Amino acid sequence: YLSQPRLTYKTVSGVNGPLVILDHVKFPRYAEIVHLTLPDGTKRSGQVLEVSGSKAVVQVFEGTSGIDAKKTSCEFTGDILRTPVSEDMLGRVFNGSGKPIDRGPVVLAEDFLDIMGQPINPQCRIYPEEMIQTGISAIDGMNSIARGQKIPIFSAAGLPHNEIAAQICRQAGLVKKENFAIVFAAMGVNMETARFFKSDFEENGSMDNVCLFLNLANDPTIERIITPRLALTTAEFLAYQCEKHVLVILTDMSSYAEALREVSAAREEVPGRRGFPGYMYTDLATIYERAGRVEGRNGSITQIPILTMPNDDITHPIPDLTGYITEGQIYVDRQLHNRQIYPPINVLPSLSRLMKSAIGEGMTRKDHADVSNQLYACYAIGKDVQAMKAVVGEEALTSDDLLYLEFLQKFERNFIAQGPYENRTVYETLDIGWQLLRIFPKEMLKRIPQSTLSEFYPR
Amino acid sequence: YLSQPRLTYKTVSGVNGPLVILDHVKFPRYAEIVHLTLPDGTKRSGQVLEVSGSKAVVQVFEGTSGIDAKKTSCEFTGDILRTPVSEDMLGRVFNGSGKPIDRGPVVLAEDFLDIMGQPINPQCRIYPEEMIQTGISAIDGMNSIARGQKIPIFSAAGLPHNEIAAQICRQAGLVFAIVFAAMGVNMETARFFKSDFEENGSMDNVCLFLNLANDPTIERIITPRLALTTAEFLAYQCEKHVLVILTDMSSYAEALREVSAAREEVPGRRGFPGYMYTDLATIYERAGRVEGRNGSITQIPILTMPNDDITHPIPDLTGYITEGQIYVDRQLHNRQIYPPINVLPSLSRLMKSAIGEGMTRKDHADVSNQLYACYAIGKDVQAMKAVVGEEALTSDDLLYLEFLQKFERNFIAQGPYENRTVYETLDIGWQLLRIFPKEMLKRIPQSTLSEFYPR
Amino acid sequence: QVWPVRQVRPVTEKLPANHPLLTGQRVLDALFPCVQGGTTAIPGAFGCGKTVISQSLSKYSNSDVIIYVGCGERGNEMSEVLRDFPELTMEVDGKVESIMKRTALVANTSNMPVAAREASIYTGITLSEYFRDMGYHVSMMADSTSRWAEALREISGRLAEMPADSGYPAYLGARLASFYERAGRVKCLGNPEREGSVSIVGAVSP
Amino acid sequence: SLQTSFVTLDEAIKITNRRVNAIEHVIIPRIERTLAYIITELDEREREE
């Protein structure tokens, strides 16, 4: 392996922003990690950015504020950035660089994996088959998530997408009729939501499932770019070598791309469309496409990215490319958060493109296809009656448009409304979903075929 | 004569995109012609874009793929690009470089003309006044063309602009060589102009320069130059009348933006280079009549506006050089109108002095000015009908909507084999002007209304 | 034999196309026909019922060879195609056969190199011109060619060339012109007088 | 009383429509075409920069 001793240069040729450029380097690698030690003693870390003959451009992680070109010693490693993975890191809280912050010890490695990762062979993938049960009714009843799906949650600043992400992590599991884990990556969080995540998951008793990667907002913007790659290499050890089912939640992927745009422009690159890098499509794809089931192993990786659309724009290139690689969306809505509904998940625009394979007999239950699209039709027909009632009044609505406004007062306050600690299992999000479909008679339910109307309506 | 022998180099000190940068060149000349020999033995030819002391920058026509630094010859001919011209190139099919693909021989030259053009004194030019009867009523009764007018067919992708043009070549005449130049066209368009000129039996008058879609891109810089130099030979030295058809001039500028990108000049409007105005003015201005010579060049280029935008840099800089334009629009194409010619943004800047008494007829200039104002008004009433509905329209505005149903079907819509004369077009145009009463034709004076209106 | 993918394979003559590419469908053969040698286009989205055509053209056409190109696609939308093509059947001479005795696939997911997705349109058109020179009638389906133009936009910015129209480079309509013109019924270059064809079935995503 | 509520709803419908059509064919296309010019001219200002 790497048994030769390491060279420790003090031949710094210049500092220019976050870049330290050395010279007379003996065979420098690309993307190799170095360890700079300052004059006073502060050890900083950095990654080699460009080599050219006897040169090396080093991008220091923690900035260059105090580096001189006379007394700074820059010890090279000779190997690229790798993570130590273990199965006993399920239950720890690491930061963006992979150091523990829960007063824990350093993780004893079972492997040292390169965090950039190799792609999966497209022949060796299987189509996603079973259900991941979250516990939130609005994304399990009508927007069900397969095993291996990549389905982002679309929201905005101020909306409670961070408590939806914390409620998924507390209650995610299988669809019971020993191999489940959650890798929660938090990029660009502040402190008061970092101690929301660190405190909620550790005293709601399910810290043992989750491996928490908390990358703060005041931490360096290069450490936000290796945070989802530390979280997905841990998930690819835990799933494709230990046969667990892993759910990978990446919180605020629009804050990854604001740290990628910052790292790109500080690499002296020229920006592309809307200022974002031109390689932004194949940079998110190296993150998102680390998913799916595999052939010959019993694990899987299902991803839930989370986005923050600026000014509720959908043509912004962070939601544009996420909707270009990932399969569907969830659409946390603002007009439901003002009306005090938790979780404020809109149903009408939301979609899971693999929902028709995660449902059915022997996966969830036999009527999960016919219930969901029936509640989807009656939610749309009510919301037309909801606006129409204001135009003509109550005395002008018949006994048809009152069944849809009386259903609509109970679909938002019983199906959508959950409360943050109420784990509705998927067998209980259908019995909720049926006792709203009994407000209508069997002569009105058009989306349900008659064979399961005979088996599930009369109770 | 060039009676010195030519220096063959093997000093290629850099290849970058479509450029080959030589060095140790002994007195290099600008706009020279080189002849590169690749390692495998094939030959491409190129042109010098810049000299600077001992180094030259060669613009290779067929692209620099496979060209290395070690064993690539570059024989410097020491001359600017001269084409061989003759009268026996009327009837041949050349490719975009000027090499024949008719399974025939090379051209045996009568002279060697510089393809870049040598500009004509404007003091000794004749103004094009004799009108070409083109048959098609939209570009004859309102947008008339004279012998010597540069006038493009603006169109877009899909519209029948190559059938509109081939109709003019069948129907052009007064009230005659063809030099065709295909730039980046597909195989089915070059199959169409061939089989139309074959069937018409005019193949002894057509000279086709075909640069297809898979022919190399930087040959399209010289393809309209190789065609127009033949035209300026056949018109000013052979005293023939020439009709030059430059289809997809959009494929000129995308191969000119390509050569200026990897050269890294200052880019202009929409990434197109700075010198795009004088470059299309190098091409479009080689037309017209001259004093003491009985030949003429009538130019009809063909464009494609991207996304049908007339304010793109290709139709907006063409409209500043050429004398009018013929607009082909997409909305009349969907309504099954052939030819789909929008007369509202169409123009002929030489129409004003080519029509009138003693050339065509007394009332030509008055009919077209009134057929303009009735189509321009009834298209505004149609956008007022979409607001207030069909019911709130006065009885002198159910006449302007009556006109549009009879203008774009009885005057515009023709059929691809009608040879409508300049008198048959006008006699259609007065039965449309009897739609109105006599006291609304406010662009036609009393002297012409008293004679031509009541029939 | 080894062929560079960006050079057109030489033919003797590029003949016109006078024979219908006959699917099993009643619409788009009684209404909107295609020929052996022609170039089509299809909107490929989620839930358009797109997988009628990609599987009818593979089983029921008069094509002898299918070359399926998947350029820059999703992860679990490429694995769906690789799952159901090795079980799709076809019956000539009564006996049944899998269609993987006459298809080749070019699978490029999003996770691939960006330059491998630019050269998946060109790899699948060069293989389709290798059987066309045998005299077969190849029908090629280039699924989601708008992902290929998303790959070319990166390669254009990889070399620092200036974006022209909506971020795409200058040569967007020209590499699409230098691809759909390699389709056509040709007369092959060779002695025993054959005549092949290539039909390109594109797929776009507005 | 029935023929006098007819000609009040016959005049109020024939005004609202001329006001749905005055948004569909006049106002909203003008706001869309200036949107398709801001996304064009700012592609130009990114390209020159």
From Swiss-Prot, chain B:
The keyword Calcium does not apply. It is a peripheral membrane protein. One of its GO terms (molecular function) is ATP binding. PROSITE patterns: ATPASE_ALPHA_BETA. Keywords: ATP-binding, Cell membrane, Cytoplasm, Cytoplasmic vesicle, Hydrogen ion transport, Ion transport, Membrane, Nucleotide-binding, Synapse, Transport. Disulfide bonds: none annotated. One of its GO terms (cellular component) is vacuolar proton-transporting V-type ATPase, V1 domain. Non-catalytic subunit of the V1 complex of vacuolar(H+)-ATPase (V-ATPase), a multisubunit enzyme composed of a peripheral complex (V1) that hydrolyzes ATP and a membrane integral complex (V0) that translocates protons. V-ATPase is responsible for acidifying and maintaining the pH of intracellular compartments and in some cell types, is targeted to the plasma membrane, where it is responsible for acidifying the extracellular environment. V-ATPase is a heteromultimeric enzyme made up of two complexes: the ATP-hydrolytic V1 complex and the proton translocation V0 complex. The V1 complex consists of three catalytic AB heterodimers that form a heterohexamer, three peripheral stalks each consisting of EG heterodimers, one central rotor including subunits D and F, and the regulatory subunits C and H. The proton translocation complex V0 consists of the proton transport subunit a, a ring of proteolipid subunits c9c'', rotary subunit d, subunits e and f, and the accessory subunits ATP6AP1/Ac45 and ATP6AP2/PRR. This is V-type proton ATPase subunit B, brain isoform. It comes from Bos taurus.
From Swiss-Prot, chain C:
Expressed in brain (at protein level). It is found in: Cytoplasm; Cytoplasm, Cytosol; Cytoplasmic vesicle, Secretory vesicle; Cytoplasmic vesicle, Clathrin-coated vesicle membrane. Phosphorylation at Ser-178 by AMPK down-regulates its enzyme activity. ATP binds at G44, A45, F46, G47, C48, G49, K50, T51. The modification Phosphoserine is found at S178. Belongs to the ATPase alpha/beta chains family. Catalytic subunit of the V1 complex of vacuolar(H+)-ATPase (V-ATPase), a multisubunit enzyme composed of a peripheral complex (V1) that hydrolyzes ATP and a membrane integral complex (V0) that translocates protons. V-ATPase is responsible for acidifying and maintaining the pH of intracellular compartments and in some cell types, is targeted to the plasma membrane, where it is responsible for acidifying the extracellular environment. V-ATPase is a heteromultimeric enzyme made up of two complexes: the ATP-hydrolytic V1 complex and the proton translocation V0 complex. The V1 complex consists of three catalytic AB heterodimers that form a heterohexamer, three peripheral stalks each consisting of EG heterodimers, one central rotor including subunits D and F, and the regulatory subunits C and H. The proton translocation complex V0 consists of the proton transport subunit a, a ring of proteolipid subunits c9c'', rotary subunit d, subunits e and f, and the accessory subunits ATP6AP1/Ac45 and ATP6AP2/PRR. This is V-type proton ATPase catalytic subunit A. The chain holds residues 207 to 412 of 617 of the full protein.
